[PDB]
Amino acid sequence: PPGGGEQEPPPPPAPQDVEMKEEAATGGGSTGEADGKTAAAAAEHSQRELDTVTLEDIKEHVKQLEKAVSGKEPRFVLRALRMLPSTSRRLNHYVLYKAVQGFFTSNNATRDFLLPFLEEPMDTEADLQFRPRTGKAASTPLLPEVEAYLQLLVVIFMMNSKRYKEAQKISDDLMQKISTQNRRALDLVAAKCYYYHARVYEFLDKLDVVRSFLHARLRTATLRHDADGQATLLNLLLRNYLHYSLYDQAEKLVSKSVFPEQANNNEWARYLYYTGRIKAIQLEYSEARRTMTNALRKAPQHTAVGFKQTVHKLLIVVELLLGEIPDRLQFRQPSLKRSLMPYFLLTQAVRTGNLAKFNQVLDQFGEKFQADGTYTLIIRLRHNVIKTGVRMISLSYSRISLADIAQKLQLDSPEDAEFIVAKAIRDGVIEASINHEKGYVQSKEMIDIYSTREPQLAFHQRISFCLDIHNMSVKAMRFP
């Protein structure tokens, strides 16, 4: 009781200090300015809801003795939130439940008491037509149930809480969704709950009847609103279709839903990456690396970014497949350095011409590549090792025996050492001829490449590109 009564009594009110200022300012705003007048294309309540997801990601950790959040639920759920003269008593009810935690004891919600914390939208003239309240009054309890996820006989409490929000989601899909942004501000509440709708299901449940419900969700999308409904319903469509073998890749080629034209700078950034791997996994190399690069330089400024630990790995998988390689550790971190050393040792073998050096990696770190889920692209680098090597040898040696190149590439056979060189010319790596009767492979010396048209093609790509950024500097300037 002294170790309790000095360390337990400040966890109730100082969260009550900041929760009368963040979602009470959201409840004070997004009931009267999302159901109210307007929250326009330049709104604040979405970014305010962006402020009330991230703060509560790392806010709550403990099972909430002293009712420091276990008493917030009997506070924050007895809410009509209809109009100002009936919420002037509710502005007292933000303080009337504070002494319920203090003078008395509330109901400590420890893994059992969430069932009398969900049935309240009948109590004291509550509604569901005001879904700028009730979609947020879903998400204000729907987040902290599932934020820790706590995975011990809880899943049904998360489910029935989603079912009441799914009842709000059907009223979203059918009933009066126009110019109140009832779809728009709840497409985020659709999108943000889907990740809590998935990590429940990616932990212990199925995946696929939600997909047909997501097709029914994609049905009404772009069918009433063409803003942030075309965007988040397609990355959340793709998120396990890539990991499954179902159709979902040539469908997304001819699909019209490729461009929502705006997706709020962070869901748009990874959007070019989930379809960036689709061209990577189905052999479309050169088209992929520009939507892989564009999916990199549109991401914000966080540090614990473990998906960015994957895109920097994957972006130069396909560039090893094309030949080009940048320095990958050019932004090396204390958390990037350990995530590069098996994969950086791979491209060490690629810039060399050795053949079973590839085999000395693929037995040492063959298990690591299957953890990242990338092995099926790794296995085909032996075509690109041998074309790197045959370009390397033909440029160095001019008149080399074909019964010498195989011993240097440890090919163990001169009789197909002619044959890779045949496919080197069929692909077009080296030009010159082979004296198959003698055995030497002669190469012609290069000639005046300066007086060829091809450096103008190095220019014309970049003349037209540099006039574009001068035009974009004009088009983005005179907003005043």
């Binding site: 997801v53 991230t54 991401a299 998906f307 630990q309 994957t310």
Partner: protein, 40 residues
């Protein structure tokens, strides 16, 4: 801010190119020259 919906979870560059060339090739190439005289 800083949401990032998580689905899953000079001094440096020139020597890395120099690390690429002699990665496993004659690191302390100092004493083979003392042994290459009587052989070659």
């Amino acid at each position: 801010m800083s949401e990032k919906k998580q689905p899953v979870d000079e001094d440096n560059w020139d020597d890395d190119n120099v690390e690429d060339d002699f990665s496993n090739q004659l690191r302390a190439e100092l004493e083979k020259h003392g042994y290459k005289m009587e052989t070659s």
